[PDB]
Short mmCIF file of C-alpha atoms (C1' of nucleotides) and ligand atoms in Angstrom, two decimals:
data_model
loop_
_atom_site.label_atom_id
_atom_site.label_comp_id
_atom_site.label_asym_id
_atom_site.label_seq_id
_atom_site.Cartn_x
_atom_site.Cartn_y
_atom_site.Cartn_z
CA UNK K 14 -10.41 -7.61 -19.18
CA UNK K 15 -13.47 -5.75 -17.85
CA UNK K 16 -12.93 -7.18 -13.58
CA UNK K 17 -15.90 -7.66 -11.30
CA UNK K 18 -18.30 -5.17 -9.79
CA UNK K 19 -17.94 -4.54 -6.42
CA UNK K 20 -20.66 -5.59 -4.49
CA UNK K 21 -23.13 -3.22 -2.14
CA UNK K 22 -24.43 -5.56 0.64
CA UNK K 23 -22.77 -4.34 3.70
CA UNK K 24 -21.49 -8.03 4.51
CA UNK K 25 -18.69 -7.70 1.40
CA UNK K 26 -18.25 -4.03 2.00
CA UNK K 27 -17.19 -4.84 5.39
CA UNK K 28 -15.28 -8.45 4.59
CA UNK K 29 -12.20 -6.94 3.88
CA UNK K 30 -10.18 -5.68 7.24
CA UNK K 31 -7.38 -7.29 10.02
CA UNK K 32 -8.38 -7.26 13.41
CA UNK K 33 -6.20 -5.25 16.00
CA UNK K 34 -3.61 -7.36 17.51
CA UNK K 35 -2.90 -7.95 21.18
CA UNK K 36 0.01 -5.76 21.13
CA UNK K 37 -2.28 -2.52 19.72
CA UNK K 38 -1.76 -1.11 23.51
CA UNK K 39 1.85 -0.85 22.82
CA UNK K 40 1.56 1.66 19.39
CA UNK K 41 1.07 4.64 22.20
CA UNK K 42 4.67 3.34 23.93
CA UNK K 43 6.09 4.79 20.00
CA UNK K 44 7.75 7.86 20.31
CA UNK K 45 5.94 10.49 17.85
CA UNK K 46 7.70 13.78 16.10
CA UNK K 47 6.10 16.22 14.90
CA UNK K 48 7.59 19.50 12.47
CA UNK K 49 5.65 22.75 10.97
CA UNK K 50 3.72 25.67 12.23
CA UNK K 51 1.13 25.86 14.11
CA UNK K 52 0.01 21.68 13.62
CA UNK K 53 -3.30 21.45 15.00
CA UNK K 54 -2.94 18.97 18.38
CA UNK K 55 -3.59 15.72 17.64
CA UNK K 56 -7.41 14.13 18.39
CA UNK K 57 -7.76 11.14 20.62
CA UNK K 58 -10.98 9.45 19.17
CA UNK K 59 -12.85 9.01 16.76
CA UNK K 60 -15.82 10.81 18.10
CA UNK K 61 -14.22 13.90 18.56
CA UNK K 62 -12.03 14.68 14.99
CA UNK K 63 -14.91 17.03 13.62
CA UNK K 64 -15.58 13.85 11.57
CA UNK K 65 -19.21 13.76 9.69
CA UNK K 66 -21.43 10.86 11.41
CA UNK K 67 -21.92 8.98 8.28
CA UNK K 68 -17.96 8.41 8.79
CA UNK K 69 -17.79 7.72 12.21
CA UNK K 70 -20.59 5.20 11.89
CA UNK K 71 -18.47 3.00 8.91
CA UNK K 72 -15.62 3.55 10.76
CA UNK K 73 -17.54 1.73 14.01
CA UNK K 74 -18.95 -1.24 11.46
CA UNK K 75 -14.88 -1.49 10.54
CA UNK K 76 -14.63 -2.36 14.19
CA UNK K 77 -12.16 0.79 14.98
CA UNK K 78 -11.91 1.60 18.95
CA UNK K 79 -9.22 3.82 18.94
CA UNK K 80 -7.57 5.97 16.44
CA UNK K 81 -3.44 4.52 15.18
CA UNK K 82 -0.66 7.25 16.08
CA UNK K 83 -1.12 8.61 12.59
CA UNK K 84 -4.67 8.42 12.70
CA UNK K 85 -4.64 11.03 15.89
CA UNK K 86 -1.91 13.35 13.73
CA UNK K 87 -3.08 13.45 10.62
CA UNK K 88 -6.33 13.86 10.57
CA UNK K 89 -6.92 16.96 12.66
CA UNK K 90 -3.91 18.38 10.00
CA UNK K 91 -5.65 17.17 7.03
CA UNK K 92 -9.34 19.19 8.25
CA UNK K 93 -7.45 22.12 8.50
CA UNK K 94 -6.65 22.16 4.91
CA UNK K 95 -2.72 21.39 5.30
CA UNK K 96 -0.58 19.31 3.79
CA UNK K 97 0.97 16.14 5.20
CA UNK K 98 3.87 14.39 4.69
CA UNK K 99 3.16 11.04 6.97
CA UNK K 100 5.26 8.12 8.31
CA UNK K 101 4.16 5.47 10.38
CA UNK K 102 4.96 1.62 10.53
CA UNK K 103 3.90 -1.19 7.82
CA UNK K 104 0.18 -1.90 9.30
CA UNK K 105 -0.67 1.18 11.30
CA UNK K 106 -3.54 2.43 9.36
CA UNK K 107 -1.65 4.85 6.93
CA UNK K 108 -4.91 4.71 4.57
CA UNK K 109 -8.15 5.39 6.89
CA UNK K 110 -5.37 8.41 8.40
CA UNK K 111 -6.80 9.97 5.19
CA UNK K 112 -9.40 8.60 3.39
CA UNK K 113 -11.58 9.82 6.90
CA UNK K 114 -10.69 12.84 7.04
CA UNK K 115 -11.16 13.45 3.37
CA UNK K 116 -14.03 11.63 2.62
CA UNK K 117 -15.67 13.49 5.55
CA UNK K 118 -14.43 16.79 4.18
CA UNK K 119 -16.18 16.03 1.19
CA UNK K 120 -19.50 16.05 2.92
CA UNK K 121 -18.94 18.82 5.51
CA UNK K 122 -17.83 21.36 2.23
CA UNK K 123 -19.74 19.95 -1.06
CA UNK K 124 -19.32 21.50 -4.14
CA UNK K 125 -20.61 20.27 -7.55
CA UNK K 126 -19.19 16.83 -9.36
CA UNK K 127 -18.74 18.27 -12.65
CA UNK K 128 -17.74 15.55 -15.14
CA UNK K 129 -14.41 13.80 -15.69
CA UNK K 130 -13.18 16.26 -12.92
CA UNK K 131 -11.98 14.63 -9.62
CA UNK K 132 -12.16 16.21 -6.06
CA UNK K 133 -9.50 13.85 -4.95
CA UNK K 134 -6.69 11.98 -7.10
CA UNK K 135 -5.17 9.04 -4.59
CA UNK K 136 -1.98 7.52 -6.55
CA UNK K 137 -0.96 3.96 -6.01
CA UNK K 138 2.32 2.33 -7.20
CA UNK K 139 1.12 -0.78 -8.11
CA UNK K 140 -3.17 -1.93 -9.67
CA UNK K 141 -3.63 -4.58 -6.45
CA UNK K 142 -2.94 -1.92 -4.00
CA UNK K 143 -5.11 0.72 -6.25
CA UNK K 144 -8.18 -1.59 -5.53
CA UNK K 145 -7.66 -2.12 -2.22
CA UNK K 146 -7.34 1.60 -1.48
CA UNK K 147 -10.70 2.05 -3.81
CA UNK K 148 -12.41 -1.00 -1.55
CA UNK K 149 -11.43 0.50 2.04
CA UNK K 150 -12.99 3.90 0.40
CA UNK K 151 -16.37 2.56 -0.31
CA UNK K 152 -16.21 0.80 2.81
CA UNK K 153 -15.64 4.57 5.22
CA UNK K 154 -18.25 6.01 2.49
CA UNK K 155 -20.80 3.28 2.56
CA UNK K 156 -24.63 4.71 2.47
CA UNK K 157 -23.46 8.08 1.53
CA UNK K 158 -23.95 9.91 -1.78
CA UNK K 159 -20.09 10.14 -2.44
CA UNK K 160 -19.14 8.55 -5.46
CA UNK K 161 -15.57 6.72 -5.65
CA UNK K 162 -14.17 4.99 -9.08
CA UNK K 163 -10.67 3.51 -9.74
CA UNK K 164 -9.04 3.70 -12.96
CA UNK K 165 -5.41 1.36 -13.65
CA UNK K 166 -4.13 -1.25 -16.45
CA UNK K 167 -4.36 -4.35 -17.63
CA UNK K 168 -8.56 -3.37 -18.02
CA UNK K 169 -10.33 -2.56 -20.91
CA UNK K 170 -10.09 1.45 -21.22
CA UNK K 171 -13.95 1.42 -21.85
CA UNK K 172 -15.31 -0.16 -18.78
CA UNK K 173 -13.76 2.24 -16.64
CA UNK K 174 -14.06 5.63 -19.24
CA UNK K 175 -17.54 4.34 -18.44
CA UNK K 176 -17.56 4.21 -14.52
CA UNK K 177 -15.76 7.70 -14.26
CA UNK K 178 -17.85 9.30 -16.70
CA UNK K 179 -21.10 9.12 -14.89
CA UNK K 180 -19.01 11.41 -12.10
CA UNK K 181 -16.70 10.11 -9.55
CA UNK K 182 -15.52 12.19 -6.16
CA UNK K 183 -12.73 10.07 -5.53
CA UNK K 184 -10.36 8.67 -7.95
CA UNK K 185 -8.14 5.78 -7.16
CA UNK K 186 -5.48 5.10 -9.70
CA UNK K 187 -2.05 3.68 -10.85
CA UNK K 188 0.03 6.65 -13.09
CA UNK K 189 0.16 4.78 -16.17
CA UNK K 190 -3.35 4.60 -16.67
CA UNK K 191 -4.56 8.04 -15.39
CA UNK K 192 -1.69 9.73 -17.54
CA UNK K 193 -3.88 8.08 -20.22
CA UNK K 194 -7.47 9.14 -19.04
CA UNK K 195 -5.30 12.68 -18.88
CA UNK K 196 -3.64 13.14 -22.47
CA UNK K 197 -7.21 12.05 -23.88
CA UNK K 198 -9.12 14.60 -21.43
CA UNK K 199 -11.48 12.50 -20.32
CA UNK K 200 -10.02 13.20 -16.93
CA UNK K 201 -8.93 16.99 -15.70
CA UNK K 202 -8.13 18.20 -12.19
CA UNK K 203 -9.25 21.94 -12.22
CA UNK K 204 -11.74 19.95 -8.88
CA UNK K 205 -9.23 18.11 -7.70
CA UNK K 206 -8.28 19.81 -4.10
CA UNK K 207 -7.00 16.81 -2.64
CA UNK K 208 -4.05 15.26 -4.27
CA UNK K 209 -2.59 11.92 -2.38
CA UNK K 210 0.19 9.67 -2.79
CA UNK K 211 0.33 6.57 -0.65
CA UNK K 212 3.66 4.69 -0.60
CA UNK K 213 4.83 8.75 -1.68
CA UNK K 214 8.50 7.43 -1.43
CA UNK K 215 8.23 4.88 -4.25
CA UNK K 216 6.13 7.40 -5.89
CA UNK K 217 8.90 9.83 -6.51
CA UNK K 218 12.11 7.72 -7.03
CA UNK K 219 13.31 7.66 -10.23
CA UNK K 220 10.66 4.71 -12.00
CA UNK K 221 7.76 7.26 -10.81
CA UNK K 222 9.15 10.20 -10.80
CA UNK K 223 8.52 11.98 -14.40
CA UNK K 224 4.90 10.70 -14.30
CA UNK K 225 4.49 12.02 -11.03
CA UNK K 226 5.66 15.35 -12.07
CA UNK K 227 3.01 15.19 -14.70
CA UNK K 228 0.59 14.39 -12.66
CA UNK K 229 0.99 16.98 -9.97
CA UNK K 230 2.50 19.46 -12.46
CA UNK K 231 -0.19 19.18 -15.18
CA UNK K 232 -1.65 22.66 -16.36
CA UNK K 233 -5.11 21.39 -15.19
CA UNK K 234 -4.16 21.50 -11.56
CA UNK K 235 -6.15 23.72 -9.55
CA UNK K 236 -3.91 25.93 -7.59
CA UNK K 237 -5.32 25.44 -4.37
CA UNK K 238 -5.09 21.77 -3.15
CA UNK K 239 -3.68 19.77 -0.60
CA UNK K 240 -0.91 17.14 -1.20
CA UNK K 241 -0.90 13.96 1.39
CA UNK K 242 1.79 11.50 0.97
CA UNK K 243 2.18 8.34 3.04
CA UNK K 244 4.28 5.52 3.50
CA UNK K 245 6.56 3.57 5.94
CA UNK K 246 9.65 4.18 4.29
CA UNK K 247 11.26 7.67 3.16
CA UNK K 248 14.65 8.01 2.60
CA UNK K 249 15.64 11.44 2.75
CA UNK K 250 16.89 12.13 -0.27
CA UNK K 251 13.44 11.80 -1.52
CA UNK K 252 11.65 13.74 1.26
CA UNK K 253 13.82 16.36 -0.20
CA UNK K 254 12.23 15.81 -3.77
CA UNK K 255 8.35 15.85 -2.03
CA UNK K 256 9.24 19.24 -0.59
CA UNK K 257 9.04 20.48 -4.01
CA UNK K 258 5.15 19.43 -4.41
CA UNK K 259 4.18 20.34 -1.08
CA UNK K 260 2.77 23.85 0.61
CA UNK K 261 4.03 24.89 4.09
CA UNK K 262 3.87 21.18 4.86
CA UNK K 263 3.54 19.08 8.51
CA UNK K 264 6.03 16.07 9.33
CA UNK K 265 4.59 13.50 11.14
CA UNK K 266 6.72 10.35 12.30
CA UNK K 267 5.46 7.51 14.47
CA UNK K 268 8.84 5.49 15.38
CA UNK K 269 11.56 5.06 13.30
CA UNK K 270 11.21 6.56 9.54
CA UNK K 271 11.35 3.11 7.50
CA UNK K 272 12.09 1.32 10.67
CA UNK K 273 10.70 -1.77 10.47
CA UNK K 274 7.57 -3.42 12.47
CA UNK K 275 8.74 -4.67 15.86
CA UNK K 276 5.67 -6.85 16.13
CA UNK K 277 7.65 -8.88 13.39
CA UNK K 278 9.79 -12.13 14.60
CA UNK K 279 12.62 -12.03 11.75
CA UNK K 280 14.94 -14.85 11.24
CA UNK K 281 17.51 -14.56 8.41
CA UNK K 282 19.32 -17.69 7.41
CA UNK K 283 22.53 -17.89 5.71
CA UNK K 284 21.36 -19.75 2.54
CA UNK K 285 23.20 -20.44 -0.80
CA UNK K 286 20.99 -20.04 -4.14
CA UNK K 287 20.79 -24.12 -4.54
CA UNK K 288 19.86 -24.92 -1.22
CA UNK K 289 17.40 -22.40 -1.09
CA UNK K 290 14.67 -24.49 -2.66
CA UNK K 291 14.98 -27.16 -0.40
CA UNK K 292 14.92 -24.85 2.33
CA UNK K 293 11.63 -23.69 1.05
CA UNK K 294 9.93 -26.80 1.45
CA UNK K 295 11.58 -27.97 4.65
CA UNK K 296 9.79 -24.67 5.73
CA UNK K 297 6.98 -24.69 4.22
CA UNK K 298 6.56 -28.48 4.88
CA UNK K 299 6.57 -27.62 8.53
CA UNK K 300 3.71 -25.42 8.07
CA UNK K 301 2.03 -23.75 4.83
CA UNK K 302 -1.08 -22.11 5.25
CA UNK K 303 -1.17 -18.11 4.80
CA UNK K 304 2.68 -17.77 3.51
CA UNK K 305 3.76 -15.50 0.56
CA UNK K 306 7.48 -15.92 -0.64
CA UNK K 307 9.07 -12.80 -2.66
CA UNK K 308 11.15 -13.54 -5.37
CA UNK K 309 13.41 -11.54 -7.36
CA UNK K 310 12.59 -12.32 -11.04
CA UNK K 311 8.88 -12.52 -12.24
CA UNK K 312 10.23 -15.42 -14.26
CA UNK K 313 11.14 -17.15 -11.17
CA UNK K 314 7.93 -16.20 -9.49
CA UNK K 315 6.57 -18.11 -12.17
CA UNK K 316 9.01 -21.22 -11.87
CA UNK K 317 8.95 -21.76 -8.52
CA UNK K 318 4.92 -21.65 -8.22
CA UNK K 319 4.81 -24.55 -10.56
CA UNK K 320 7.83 -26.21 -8.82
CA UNK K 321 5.92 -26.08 -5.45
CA UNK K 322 2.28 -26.96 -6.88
CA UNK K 323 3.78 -30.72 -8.54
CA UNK K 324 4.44 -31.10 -5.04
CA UNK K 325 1.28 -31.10 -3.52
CA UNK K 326 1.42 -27.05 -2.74
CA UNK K 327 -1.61 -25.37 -3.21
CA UNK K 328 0.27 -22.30 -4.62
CA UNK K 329 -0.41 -19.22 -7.34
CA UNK K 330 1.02 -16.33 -8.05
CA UNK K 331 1.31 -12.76 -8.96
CA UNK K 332 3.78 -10.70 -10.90
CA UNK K 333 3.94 -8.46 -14.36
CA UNK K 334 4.45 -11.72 -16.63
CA UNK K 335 0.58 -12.70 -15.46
CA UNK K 336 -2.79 -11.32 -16.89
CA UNK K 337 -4.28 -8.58 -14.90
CA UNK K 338 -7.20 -11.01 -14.57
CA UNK K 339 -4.86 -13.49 -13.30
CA UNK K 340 -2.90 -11.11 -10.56
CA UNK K 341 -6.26 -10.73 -9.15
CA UNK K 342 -8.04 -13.77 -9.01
CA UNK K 343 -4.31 -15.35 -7.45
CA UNK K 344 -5.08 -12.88 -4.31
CA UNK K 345 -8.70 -13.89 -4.33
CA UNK K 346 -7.83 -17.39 -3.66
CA UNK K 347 -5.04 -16.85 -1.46
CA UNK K 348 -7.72 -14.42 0.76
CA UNK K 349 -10.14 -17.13 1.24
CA UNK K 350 -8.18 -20.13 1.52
CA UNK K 351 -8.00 -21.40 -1.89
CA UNK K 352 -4.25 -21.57 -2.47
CA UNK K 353 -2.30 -21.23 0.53
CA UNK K 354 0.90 -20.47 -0.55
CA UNK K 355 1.19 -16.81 -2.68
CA UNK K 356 5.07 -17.01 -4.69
CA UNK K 357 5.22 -12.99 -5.75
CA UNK K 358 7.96 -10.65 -6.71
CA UNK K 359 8.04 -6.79 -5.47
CA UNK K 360 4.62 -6.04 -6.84
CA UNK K 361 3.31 -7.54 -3.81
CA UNK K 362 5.63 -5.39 -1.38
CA UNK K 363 3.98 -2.70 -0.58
CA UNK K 364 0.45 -2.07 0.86
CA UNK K 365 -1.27 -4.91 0.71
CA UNK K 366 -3.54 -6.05 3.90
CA UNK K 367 -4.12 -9.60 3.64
CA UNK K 368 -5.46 -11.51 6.85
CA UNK K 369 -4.50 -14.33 6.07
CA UNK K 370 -0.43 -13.64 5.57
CA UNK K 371 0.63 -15.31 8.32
CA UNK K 372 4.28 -15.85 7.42
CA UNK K 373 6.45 -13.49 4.77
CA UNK K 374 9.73 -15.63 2.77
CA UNK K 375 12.08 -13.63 1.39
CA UNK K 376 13.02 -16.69 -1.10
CA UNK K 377 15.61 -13.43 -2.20
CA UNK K 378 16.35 -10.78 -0.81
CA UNK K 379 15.60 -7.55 -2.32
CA UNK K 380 18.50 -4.86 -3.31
CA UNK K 381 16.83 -2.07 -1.03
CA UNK K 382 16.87 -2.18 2.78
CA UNK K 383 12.85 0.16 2.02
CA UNK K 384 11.84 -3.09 0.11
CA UNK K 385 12.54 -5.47 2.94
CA UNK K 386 11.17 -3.55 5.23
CA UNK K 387 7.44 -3.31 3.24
CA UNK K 388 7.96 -6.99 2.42
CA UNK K 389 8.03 -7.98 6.27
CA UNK K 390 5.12 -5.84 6.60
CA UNK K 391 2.63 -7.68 5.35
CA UNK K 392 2.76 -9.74 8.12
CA UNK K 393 2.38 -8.58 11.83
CA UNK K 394 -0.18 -5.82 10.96
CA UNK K 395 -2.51 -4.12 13.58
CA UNK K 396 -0.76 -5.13 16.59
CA UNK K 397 -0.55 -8.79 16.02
CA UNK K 398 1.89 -11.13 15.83
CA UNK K 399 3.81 -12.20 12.51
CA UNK K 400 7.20 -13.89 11.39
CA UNK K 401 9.53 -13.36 8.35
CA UNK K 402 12.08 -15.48 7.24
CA UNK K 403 14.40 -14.31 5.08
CA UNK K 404 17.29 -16.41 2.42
CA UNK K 405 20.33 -14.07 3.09
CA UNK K 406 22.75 -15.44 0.24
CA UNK K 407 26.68 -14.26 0.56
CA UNK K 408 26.97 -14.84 -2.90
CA UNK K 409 24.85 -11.66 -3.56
CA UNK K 410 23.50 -9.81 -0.88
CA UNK K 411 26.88 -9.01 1.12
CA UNK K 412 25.54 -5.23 0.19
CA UNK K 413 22.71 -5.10 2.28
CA UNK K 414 24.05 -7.04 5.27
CA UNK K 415 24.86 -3.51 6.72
CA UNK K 416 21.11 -2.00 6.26
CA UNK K 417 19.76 -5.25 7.72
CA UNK K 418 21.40 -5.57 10.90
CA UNK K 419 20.43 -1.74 11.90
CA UNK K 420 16.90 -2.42 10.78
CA UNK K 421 17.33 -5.96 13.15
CA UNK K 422 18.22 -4.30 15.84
CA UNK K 423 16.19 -1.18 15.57
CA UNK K 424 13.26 -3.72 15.87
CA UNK K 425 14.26 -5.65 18.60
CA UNK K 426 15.37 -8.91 16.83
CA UNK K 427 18.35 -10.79 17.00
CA UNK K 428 21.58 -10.58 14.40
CA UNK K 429 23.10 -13.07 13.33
CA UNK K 430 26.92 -13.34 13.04
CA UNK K 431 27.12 -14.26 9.23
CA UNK K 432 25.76 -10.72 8.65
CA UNK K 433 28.48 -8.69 10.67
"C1'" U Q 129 15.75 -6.09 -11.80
"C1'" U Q 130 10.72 -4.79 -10.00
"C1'" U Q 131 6.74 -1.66 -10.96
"C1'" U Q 132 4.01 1.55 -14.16
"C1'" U Q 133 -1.07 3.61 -20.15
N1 ANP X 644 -7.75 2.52 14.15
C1 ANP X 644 -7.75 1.20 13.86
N2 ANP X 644 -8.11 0.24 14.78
C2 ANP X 644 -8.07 -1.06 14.35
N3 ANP X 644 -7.71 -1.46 13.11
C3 ANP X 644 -7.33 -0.56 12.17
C4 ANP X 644 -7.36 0.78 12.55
N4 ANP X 644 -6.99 1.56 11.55
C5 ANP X 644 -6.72 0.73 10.54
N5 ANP X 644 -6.92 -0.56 10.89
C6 ANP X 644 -6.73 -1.81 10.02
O1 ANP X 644 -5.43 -2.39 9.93
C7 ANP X 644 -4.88 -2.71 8.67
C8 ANP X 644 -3.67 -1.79 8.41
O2 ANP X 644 -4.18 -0.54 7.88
P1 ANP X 644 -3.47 -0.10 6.54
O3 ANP X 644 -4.15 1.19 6.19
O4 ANP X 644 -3.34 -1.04 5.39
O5 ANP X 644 -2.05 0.25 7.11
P2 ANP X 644 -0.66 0.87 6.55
O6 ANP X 644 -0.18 1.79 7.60
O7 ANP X 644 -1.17 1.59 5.36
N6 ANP X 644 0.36 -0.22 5.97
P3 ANP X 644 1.56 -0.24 4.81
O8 ANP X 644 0.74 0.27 3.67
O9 ANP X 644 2.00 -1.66 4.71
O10 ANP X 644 2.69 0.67 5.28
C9 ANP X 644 -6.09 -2.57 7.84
O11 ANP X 644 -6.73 -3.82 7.89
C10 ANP X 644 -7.07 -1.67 8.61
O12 ANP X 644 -8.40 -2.05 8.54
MG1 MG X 645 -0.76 1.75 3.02
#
RNA sequence: UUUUU
């Protein structure tokens, strides 16, 4: 498929970003907890994290005043050469809490970029969320001699061989795809001292999990490196599994560990599967613009987009049935107005920062309390305001009724009867 | 099922 270049002039670079909310005041009003020995203290801005100038200065262009709850933990933990295990809301700026630190550790402690050997390996569970992580990087390293690079499917293997190959600090990539750059050793991590997986939880359940092991586990590992994982969600049976890949690691929780985002209005409406479509449009009839409905079934992703495009929808897509080229130009128009309804199964869940999600339909509800909670969350972000409706069906989601009433009321939203 | 060479 060979995608687009991304651009240099500071005016793209710089394009992609939500503004902080009115509620960004309350984030301090989140009780924080904190496990390990001796965790440095926490920094309270930007301009005092022993952060390299060239950082600080992107990180003022990004428009950041004040550092997110994470952002004050992790860093200072991350400079000191530890390693993290993270959790903080859907929207609380998980990714700058440590690309910043890392990026500016890579200019305050340079050693040679030897070839097809990575400083830093950052893991993604899905190829939107990979880019997005690889744009937010150039973006905190813009005008600096740090080279960055992404590697995931669905691209021709050349193009990016070729990228990587003329030397690449940072590596961005999906498993799939780097297990490949691996078993053909164009791609070895005897450099590699940082070692980060956002959305960690997803990372090691049981899809991820054997790939991870390779990755992490892989003879080419150099012995001394730090392991950051991240996410909003973390059931403990899997923190139990990271403990395995991590050294004399910190905890860090902002709120409630895969609590959901109280900035969030939920509603949840007791819907049967044939009056759900209707629904849909009554909704979305009512008001369209910047609304992504999750589906279960990438075939019905598919379905319903054309469904809601004969009738005068602007609507796309993304899911696994789509070309990669497809998935991406489908958030491209959905980013600057194009389409302004985005119909997308799970792939969608996690990560993504789009400004312009203004409303989040659970058209189904997922099987996993974690997914909902992600799905919500990509709405509300930075402070600001958001609303989620979801489709609760009794004819199939009686299991998570339980899940979804403590996540209601842990956020501060109302529960409806039908659900107890 | 959804992701993931
Ligand atoms: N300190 C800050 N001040 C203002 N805005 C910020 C700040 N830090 C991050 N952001 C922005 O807010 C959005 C949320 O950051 P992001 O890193 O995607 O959060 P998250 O915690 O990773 N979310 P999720 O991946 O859904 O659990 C992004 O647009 C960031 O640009
Ligand atoms: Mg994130």
């Amino acid at each position: 498929y060979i995608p687009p270049e991304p651009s240099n002039d500071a005016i793209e670079i710089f394009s992609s970003g939500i503004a902080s909310g009115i509620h960004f005041s309350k984030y301090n009003n989140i009780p924080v907890k904190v496990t390990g020995s001796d965790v440095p203290q926490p920094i309270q801005h930007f301009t005092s994290a022993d952060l390299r100038d060239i950082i600080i200065d992107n990180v003022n262009k990004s428009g950041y005043k004040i550092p997110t709850p994470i952002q004050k933990c992790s860093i200072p933990v991350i400079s000191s050469g530890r390693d993290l295990m993270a959790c903080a809301q859907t929207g609380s700026g998980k990714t700058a809490a440590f690309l910043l630190p890392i990026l500016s550790k890579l200019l305050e402690d340079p050693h040679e970029l030897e070839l097809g050997r990575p400083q830093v390996v950052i893991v993604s569970p899905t190829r939107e969320l990979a880019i997005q992580i690889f744009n937010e990087a150039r973006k905190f390293a813009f005008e600096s001699y740090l080279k960055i690079g992404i590697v995931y499917g669905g691209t021709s293997f050349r193009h990016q061989n070729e990228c990587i190959t003329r030397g690449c600090h940072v590596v961005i990539a999906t498993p799939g795809r780097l297990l490949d750059f691996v078993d053909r050793t164009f791609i070895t991590f005897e450099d590699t001292r940082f070692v980060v997986l956002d959305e960690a939880d997803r990372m090691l359940d049981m899809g991820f999990s054997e790939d991870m092991r390779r990755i992490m586990t892989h003879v080419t590992m150099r012995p001394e490196h730090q392991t950051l994982m991240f996410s909003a969600t973390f059931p403990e049976e899997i923190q139990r599994m990271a403990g395995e890949f991590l050294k004399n690691y910190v905890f860090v929780a902002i709120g409630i560990v895969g609590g959901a985002c109280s900035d969030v209005k939920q509603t949840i409406y007791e819907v049967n599967k044939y009056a759900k479509r209707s629904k849909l449009i009554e909704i979305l009839s009512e008001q369209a613009d910047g609304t992504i409905v999750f589906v279960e079934t990438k075939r019905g992703a598919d379905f319903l987009a054309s469904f809601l495009s004969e009738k005068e929808f602007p609507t796309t897509s993304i899911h696994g049935d789509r070309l990669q080229s497809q998935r991406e130009q489908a958030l491209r128009d959905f980013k600057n107005g194009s389409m302004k309804v985005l119909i997308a199964t799970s792939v969608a869940s996690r990560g993504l920062d789009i400004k312009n999600i203004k409303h989040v339909i659970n058209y189904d509800m997922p099987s996993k309390i974690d997914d909902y909670v992600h799905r919500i969350g990509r709405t509300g972000r930075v402070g600001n305001n958001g609303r989620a409706t979801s489709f609760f069906d009794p004819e199939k989601d009686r299991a998570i009724a339980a899940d979804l009433v403590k996540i209601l009321e842990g956020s501060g939203q109302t529960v409806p009867d039908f659900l107890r």
